[PDB]
Design a binder for these strands. Sequence first.
DNA 1: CCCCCGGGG
DNA 2: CCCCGGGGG
Length: 262
Amino acid sequence: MRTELLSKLYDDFGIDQLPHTQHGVTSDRLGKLYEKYILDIFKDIESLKKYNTNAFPQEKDISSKLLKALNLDLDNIIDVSSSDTDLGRTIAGGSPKTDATIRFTFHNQSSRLVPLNIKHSSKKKVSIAEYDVETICTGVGISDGELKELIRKHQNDQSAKLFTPVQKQRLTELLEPYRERFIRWCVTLRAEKSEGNILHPDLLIRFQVIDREYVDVTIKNIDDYVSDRIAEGSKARKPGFGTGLNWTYASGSKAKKMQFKG
DNA sequence: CCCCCGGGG
DNA sequence: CCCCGGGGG
């Protein structure tokens, strides 16, 4: 629904002045618009308490989902602030996946930095990242060998079509031990658990947007997201060789490079 | 040219 | 799962 706040933002981002033939710019504006949405909802304590009441059904849904994903109670929160994250530096794997942060201050004067990753999409799964096989292996903790070569095969072919059923099963098998580290690294840029580090996202916010309009929002903390993907990857088909991620290629440049949807 | 944000069939 | 595109640095 185009609530008071969302209307204000669609107007601010001039989303309606964009011709329904300008998909490119419309996607950038939306992506930026929906980051603002989260930022505004958590702009400060006044905003948070305001948007968490039943007077704002939608914002309340969003904020509840966020707080629930962090297992925080609105009553324990004394102050809040939010901002766009822009560190200006890369790390092992490239730029940090943190798009913005939210800082909660509780009663005892302690606080919680919550780096976020926010995307918008009309689909269930969307691109989460692209990497060269070497970076991935380095980040996940996979050394030269059978596993790396099978992955590099995927990279060069830009899919698994040239693989044999034996090789697909084989890849799924060798990867089984690295599943979680793999998933967590793809989306956070770190194989192990993290919390409050502005360099690695704690929550993954996915806005389901169809025909330019808000539909719903999903907010997962990393542990849950990983579980979901692990489960999804345990099915008979074994999506993403067990990772629950969609392996494909980055059409981005000339060098063969892998892309992961999740 | 490369990376990040996306999608269709 | 396989095949791709727009925008901006």
